[PDB]
Symmetry: D2
Subunit: 112 residues, 4 copies
C-alpha cells in the first residue's frame, strides 16, 4: 500500500474507529474525481486504498467524515469534515488527530 | 468583526505574515460562492473579512494559502492549502476565530466561538 | 508584558478559562525556583506574569494545570499537566506568547516570539 | 509491550529517527526515578521500554530530547525538551508530533 490513512481521537485517547474516508484525484478539468474510500479499522487505520500502479503523481484530496464520527459519539462537532489536499511525488501515511472543535494532520512519508 | 482568521508559523515561532485567505459560502445550488478574502497582517491576524449583517447562517469554507506562504520562504510544503469548513450561526450570531498553526508537512486548526 | 500564556479548549471551541499557570526559573544550583503564577482570564489569556526588568536570561518552565481544568468540567484527562520548558532572552529581550490547545487526552503547544 | 513512544517530524513529514527518550516513575518521595529509556527507530517508534509486570499503576514522566534532534538537523529549536506526564490505569502509546517551535502529544490507549 502506497497510501494509508490513520485517524486518532484526542478526547478518548484512542484510535478513531469506523471513520469514513474518501480520496479524490484532481482531473484535467480540475474536477475532483473519486479515487478510493473506506472506513478506519479498530486501530484507526485504513489500508489498501490503492495500488502502486494506480497511485500516479498528481494532486489528491482526502476527505475525513469527522462530523459523523462525533455525531455517533453524541458530541457536538465544529467542522463539516476534514480535508487534506497534497501533491504525490514512496509510501504516504496521512494522519489526523481529531477533537470536536480542532484537528491536526501530518504527512509521514517513508521509503522502503 | 464576527469572523477572524489567525495563522502562526511553527518553524519560526512567529505569526505567519502575508498569508492569503479566501472565504466561500455554500449557495442554494450547492456551489461555493466567493464571500470574502484578505491577507494576514504582521501579527498573523486577518480582521475585517465581513460584517454582522453580511455573515448570515450558512456553511462556510476558509481556504488558507499555505503553499504560497512556504514557497515564498524557499520551502516546498506537503499540502496544497488548508481548508476549514463549518456551519456558522445555526443557533444565532456568534463570533468565530479560525486559527491555524503551520509546519511544512503538517498543520492544525481550531475554532474559538464566543457569544458577543 | 514580555511573557503571556494563552490556553484554548479544543472540545468546546473556546478559551480555556480559569486555568492555573505556574512559572519557574532554573537557579544557579540547578533547582527550579518559583517565578510567577496566575489564572487565565475569560479570554483564555494570562497577562502580567512578569516585567522587562524581572524577566532576565534563563531557562523557564511554564506548568499549565490542565488536570484541574478538565476535572472541574467532569472529565478525567490523561495528562497530569502540560509543561513547557525553554531558554528565554539568550540573544536579547524578546516577547513570548506560550499558547496551548487542550483536549482531554492530548495537547499541543506553540511559541510566538517577537522583537518589541 | 504495554508502553510505546512514537515521534514524528512535522518539518520533514517523516518519522523522527534517533530521538532520545527517557521515562521516569514518581517515587513516594515525589522524586522522579529513572524507569526506562531508548532511541526511536527508523519508523520513529520506541518499543520494549518495559514489561507488563514492571509497568504498575502510577505517575509516569516521558522526556523527549527534542533539542538534540533539531540540533542534529541544523534547525534552531525553541524548547529544551518535551515532557509528557500521565497516570497509568491496557497498552499505551504516547505519540509526539514535533516542530522546531511547537509540539503536540496524544495518548492512544487500546485493549488487546
Ligand atoms: C498549539 C496551538 C495551536 C493553535 C493555537 C491557536 O489557534 C491560537 C489561537 C489564538 O486565538 C491565538 O491568539 C493564538 N496565539 O496567540 O498564539 C493561538 C494555539 C496553540
Ligand atoms: C500529537 C500527534 C498527532 C499526530 C500524530 C500522527 O500523525 C501519528 C502518525 C502515525 O503514523 C501513528 O501511528 C500515530 N499513532 O499511532 O499514534 C500518530 C502523532 C502525534
Amino acid at each position: 500500500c502506497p497510501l494509508m490513512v490513520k485517524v486518532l481521537d484526542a478526547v478518548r485517547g484512542s484510535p478513531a474507529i469506523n471513520v469514513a474516508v474518501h480520496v479524490f484525484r484532481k482531473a484535467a478539468d480540475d474536477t475532483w474525481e473519486p479515487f478510493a474510500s473506506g472506513k478506519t479499522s479498530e486501530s484507526g487505520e485504513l489500508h489498501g486504498l490503492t495500488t502502486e500502479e494506480e497511485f500516479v503523481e498528481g494532486i489528491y484530496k482526502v476527505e475525513i467524515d469527522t462530523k459523523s464520527y462525533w455525531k455517533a459519539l453524541g458530541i457536538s462537532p465544529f467542522h463539516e469534515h476534514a480535508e487534506v489536499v497534497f501533491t504525490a511525488n514512496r509510501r504516504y501515511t496521512i494522519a489526523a488527530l481529531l477533537s470536536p472543535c480542532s484537528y491536526s494532520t501530518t504527512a509521514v512519508v517513508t521509503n522502503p
